[PDB]
Amino acid sequence: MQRGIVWVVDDDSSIRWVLERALAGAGLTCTTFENGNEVLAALASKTPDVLLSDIRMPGMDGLALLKQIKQRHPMLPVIIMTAHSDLDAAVSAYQQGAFDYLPKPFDIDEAVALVERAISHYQE
């Protein structure tokens, strides 16, 4: 049941290949973007069930990426790979409905782990 669209924003390629096929086997649609602002463009026409954002490119490292998401999507939850920058912006995330902040590690094991158990807690 349910579609299941998981969007990721990071270095792509490596992160994409793993999360794309592997997460696809789980029954979801995993796509990746450059870092964050890219998903925003796509977000302007769609909303993923579990968004994943990077944090090492934009102004506020990555938390800034959250701000963009909350500006147009004050509900779409996002998952950041790092929280070493201005954590302040991460707060605007929790208020808009962000997912959380995961350490640099991720891959399928660490990401799929946080995604499945997370969506399961939400349910329809």
First-last CA distance in the chain: 10
Does position 85 bind ligand BEF by CB under 6 A? no
Shortest distance (Å) from residue 78 CB to ligand BEF: 12
Does position 55 bind ligand BEF by CB under 6 A? yes
Are 2 and 29 in contact, with CB atoms under 8 Å apart?
Answer: no
Burial (CB < 10 A; 0-12, 13-18, 19+), residue 89, is: buried
Report 13-52 residues binding ligand BEF (CB under 6 A).
Answer: none
Does position 69 bind ligand BEF by CB under 6 A? no
Does position 77 bind ligand BEF by CB under 6 A? no
Rg of the chain, C-alpha, whole Å: 13
Are 83 and 90 in contact, with CB atoms under 8 Å apart?
Answer: yes
Shortest distance (Å) from residue 106 CB to ligand BEF: 8
- Which residues bind to ligand BEF, rule: CB under 6 A? 10-11, 54-56, 62, 81-82, 104
